[PDB]
Structure 1
Amino acid sequence: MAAPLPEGVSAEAMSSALDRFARIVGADWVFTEDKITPYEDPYTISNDETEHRPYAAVAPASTEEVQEIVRVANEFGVPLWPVSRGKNFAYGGAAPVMSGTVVLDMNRMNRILEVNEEFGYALVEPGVSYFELYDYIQEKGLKLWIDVPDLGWGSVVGNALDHGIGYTPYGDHFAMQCGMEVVLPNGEVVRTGMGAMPGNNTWQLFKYGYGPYVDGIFSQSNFGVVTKMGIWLMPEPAGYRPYLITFENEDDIETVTERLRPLKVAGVIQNGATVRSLVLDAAITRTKSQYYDGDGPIPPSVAKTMMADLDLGMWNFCGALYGPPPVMDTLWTAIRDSFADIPGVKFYFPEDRRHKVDLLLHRAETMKGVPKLTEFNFLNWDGGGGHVGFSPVSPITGKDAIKQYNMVSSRVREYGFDYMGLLAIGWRDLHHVTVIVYDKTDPDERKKLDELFNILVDEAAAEGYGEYRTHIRYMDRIAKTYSWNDNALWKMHETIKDALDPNGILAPGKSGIWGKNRR
């Protein structure tokens, strides 16, 4: 079934828009039905073929082409779905919320404008991948690390703008942003911060500039198209020691989280360290069928067998030390002493791992910013599937961690899926990302996944828990959970949306923001 036109847009208006796009970028870089396949969500959820369908895609190579595309979209009322690389797998890929939207694919805008060793930053266009930035740094011999969101195939820009997370001390990607160029929804270009000062030498050095600090309004947003972004990069440290602490019991996560809090708030845990559930870690190197012939989630005997076979716990705390040996030794004494009295606790450095293909050796690369595709391995757990991320935020407190674990694991397993949970340790919070692996080709599994996801969102909200990020299908539902004072914040967002994008031609539905024409 082909994509429907967006509501209120005639075939004539769409067809005039697409010819104009082709004049701007060249005929090779407008993709219509029967080249639109790569822009579909790779991990389908809806059984309604009219939903989340991109009409077409346009692939510009310059900010100027982005501006002309945006001006043409305003002229014809043709909505755009901007993506940097479009690898938002488990959140919709490159697909739009609203069917009929045209993807604005910035993959070919892939210039690394600068990597500065002395100040530790990069200035990049959206199409720059983690692989590409990492390779540029290695080729030029620069003593910098990047921060990778597990997968290296995505965008330094796009991932940051979606509030993405990685696992070095620079793991809060958007927090490490400094300076950006934005094509506003009227086609005008602005630079934030010190970029607004002609002849500046500080765009990537001082976030604020002068006046209102607006960079964050273009993150998880449809207020503009970001065409250049700065990011701070960590200097190569004087030492690096990855570690893995494992826990025997699902209920250990309560005491473990209580012990993590003071270590993280004091900066003793230097990186975006993680606590990962057994199945998420096992699925990197094994499949369910190697331990169990059953059709549903694993029983306790299978969990215990996997733990003994792979030297994993029910909970696996993976982190790294950074800096000179006397600093790393001091921090390690504090971390080790915080967990050493928990019955069933085990400690590993990489040299202690018996298996040649092992989760710690993979995470040792991730926590020094090596781009990889290893994380897709968990999709093989049940014979090959897609995934969706249920990502509530939790305080770093055991009560909240064990509550969310119980609420999510119970429901996922009830719906036939194994629980695969990541607790990513932020400055003062935990990002609880549950990856639900399902057969995206089976309409019955898709139906179950959709019902489960709605339950997870509703039960979490009923407990005062909100998600930090979501799939295109649930962006309205999540926005409706942030309802304080009769949806006051989204009323403000819509006010700003109508001022910057009166014609509503930028990603209608992103973060539940639609604009007056479609509200």
Structure 2
Amino acid sequence: ADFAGAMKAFRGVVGAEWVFGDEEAVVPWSKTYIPDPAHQYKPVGAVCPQSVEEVQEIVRIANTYKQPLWTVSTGKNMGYGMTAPATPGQVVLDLKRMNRILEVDADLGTCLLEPGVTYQQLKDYLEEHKIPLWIDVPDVGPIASPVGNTLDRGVGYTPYGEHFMFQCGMEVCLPDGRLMRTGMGSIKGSTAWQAFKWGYGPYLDGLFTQSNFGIVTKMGLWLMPKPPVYKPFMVRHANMEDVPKIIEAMRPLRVSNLVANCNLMMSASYQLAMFKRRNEIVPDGAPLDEASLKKAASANGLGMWNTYFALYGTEQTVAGVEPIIRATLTASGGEVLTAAEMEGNPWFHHHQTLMQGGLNLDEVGLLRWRGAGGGLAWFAPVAAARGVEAERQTALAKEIVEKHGFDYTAAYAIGWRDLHHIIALLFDKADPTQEQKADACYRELVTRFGAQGWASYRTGVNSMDLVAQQYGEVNRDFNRTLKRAIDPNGILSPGKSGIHP
């Protein structure tokens, strides 16, 4: 890499005030929450363009100077690396200034977005124009990107919660600086770019998700019509061991699509961690015992597991399914509760907001759990939607985290036929011993889960190689063949998803 030559050329493209080219200037891009005992996940520069033409020029320069770029949209991948690159020596290509809402089609229920568009911005746009469409939001703070989130295949909590399913068309700047539109978008003045996903020939959009094959400059997204009626529910289960029965109850409701939104099944420990520090619940040095958890949860109107779902449509369609749902969940030991029973309950309010695609009030309490706080890494294994799988994964995760002196703080995001088991590894990052222990714990989670046949849907920059190692060697080789063909100079996000030039 010729770093100095690249950065000088980048100033010529975007202006000197949008290039950040030394240790002090790149501080805003360098903070992470994942464990990093060797201090190895850090950018060496950042560049912030406002147009796709600037992106193209930047890519051309990256090739000439052999200077890799780590592309982000808004860069709020918290617990997964924020804007830290996977390998040393990279410049962050921060697309936050490319924040234009290009189209919103009220009739077809679609939009077309630049990467820097935020969820807040899109929701404001819809409301200001009185367009009766909803968004589908992850459980994040004030800033996050539909484009960035979708490209990492993230998740929200309406019927449109599996974000990548609802993507339709994209524009990519390929590593040589040429633009390519997927689906119907390469037909000049196509009116169907946001209407038909697949196009003609090989379906390419998935190559640009969790990958380093292209820079997405525009993305189409389907949006759900606002329903006449929205009815949120909470199911409370009393015992830690209820895990398998909850999944077995929900599975039929989801496979038959009586419930259609992604359902967060939240542990009491996670819920408490959102609003309380660990030392409000148990002494430092003591385990997070189930009696203390149960007492604390009960005092706050929570069970040991609390699962959130909603119904959408009319009073009549809601009444068609609500009885069967109530029967199935009550038979599993759950108490089904509505807004009228959960008045003033901040967890119910939190999920009632999420499940209509509302924006919650900034405040990530999770970062202050243990000691000085500041340590969070997601460990996010997949399971089939089978109670026995959830039972076993809960047991193994708890065993491993507790062996390293950490707590089990987790949720299951229940999907159609799958679960995303979301495990927050919360630690005191400011204590270097605790950061080292969290690193060791994380490695043990990945390795031992992999040995039982389980691996992650998504992971942070510090674990992308170790997670890749859980999946097949042929897969690893095939990804590398694609990388080398698409990006011969290896200038896009080396190490993303364990893919190296």
TM-score higher than 0.5 here? yes
- Return the letter of the residue paired with 2:173: V
* Stretch deviating more after TM superposition (409-418 or 368-377): 368-377
- Return the letter of the residue paired with 2:109: G
Count residues in correspondence. 498
What is the Cα deviation at residue 296 of structure 1? 4.3
- Return the letter of the residue paired with 1:368: Q
Q: Which residue of 2 aligns with 1:398?
A: 387
- Return the letter of the residue paired with 2:380: S
Q: Which residue of 2 aligns with 1:335?
A: 325
Q: Which residue of 2 aligns with 1:514?
A: 500
Q: Which residue of 2 aligns with 1:3?
A: none
For residue 488 of structure 1, give the secondary structure of its aligned residue in structure 2: helix
Measure the CA separation in 1 of the matches of 2:279 and 2:438: 21
* Stretch deviating more after TM superposition (332-341 or 170-179): 332-341
* 1:433 counterpart = 2:419: no
Closer/same/farther in 2, CA of residues 305 and 122 from structure 1, 3 Å limit: same
Percentage identity across aligned positions? 43
Q: Which residue of 2 aligns with 1:95?
A: 84
Closer/same/farther in 2, CA of residues 394 and 103 from structure 1, 3 Å limit: same
Measure the CA separation in 2 of the matches of 1:296 and 1:19: 55
* 1:26 counterpart = 2:15: yes
Q: Which residue of 2 aligns with 1:475?
A: 464
Measure the CA separation in 2 of the matches of 1:242 and 1:297: 34
* 1:45 counterpart = 2:31: no
Cα-to-partner distance string for 1:253-278 (whole Å, 9 max, x where unaligned): 11111111111111111101111111
> Any conservation in 2 of the 1:284–1:359 contact (CA below 8 Å)?
no
Q: Which residue of 2 aligns with 1:162?
A: 152
Closer/same/farther in 2, CA of residues 296 and 103 from structure 1, 3 Å limit: farther
* 1:212 counterpart = 2:199: no
Measure the CA separation in 1 of the matches of 2:286 and 2:67: 45
Determine which of 265, 273, 280 is the counterpart of 2:263: 273
Q: Which residue of 1 aligns with 2:353?
A: 365
- Return the letter of the residue paired with 2:180: V
Measure the CA separation in 2 of the matches of 1:200 and 1:243: 42
- Return the letter of the residue paired with 2:58: I
> Any conservation in 1 of the 2:34–2:80 contact (CA below 8 Å)?
no
What is the Cα deviation at residue 409 of structure 1? 1.6
Cα-to-partner distance string for 1:318-356 (whole Å, 9 max, x where unaligned): 11111111111222212111121334x3221122125x2
Q: Which residue of 2 aligns with 1:348?
A: 337
> Any conservation in 1 of the 2:72–2:92 contact (CA below 8 Å)?
yes
What is the Cα deviation at residue 357 of structure 1? 4.9
- Return the letter of the residue paired with 2:369: W
* 1:135 counterpart = 2:124: yes
Closer/same/farther in 2, CA of residues 331 and 42 from structure 1, 3 Å limit: same
Measure the CA separation in 2 of the matches of 1:481 and 1:157: 27
Measure the CA separation in 1 of the matches of 2:457 and 2:93: 24
TM-score by length of 2: 0.97
What is the Cα deviation at residue 413 of structure 1? 2.2
- Return the letter of the residue paired with 2:489: N
Unmatched 5+ stretches in structure 2: none
Determine which of 400, 404, 417 is the counterpart of 2:406: 417
What is the Cα deviation at residue 291 of structure 1? 2.9
> Any conservation in 2 of the 1:296–1:416 contact (CA below 8 Å)?
no
* 1:289 counterpart = 2:268: no
For residues 320-331 of structure 1, the aligned pairs below 5 Å read 320-331=310-321
Give structure 1 regions of 4+ aligned residues with deviation exceeding 6 angstroms.
none
TM-score by length of 1: 0.94
Q: RMSD between aligned alpha carbons?
A: 1.3
What is the Cα deviation at residue 375 of structure 1? 6.5
* 1:148 counterpart = 2:130: no
Measure the CA separation in 2 of the matches of 1:440 and 1:290: 19
Determine which of 290, 304, 318 is the counterpart of 2:294: 304
Unmatched 5+ stretches in structure 1: 1-8
Q: Which residue of 2 aligns with 1:500?
A: 486
Measure the CA separation in 1 of the matches of 2:317 and 2:137: 24
For residues 216-227 of structure 1, the aligned pairs below 5 Å read 216-227=206-217
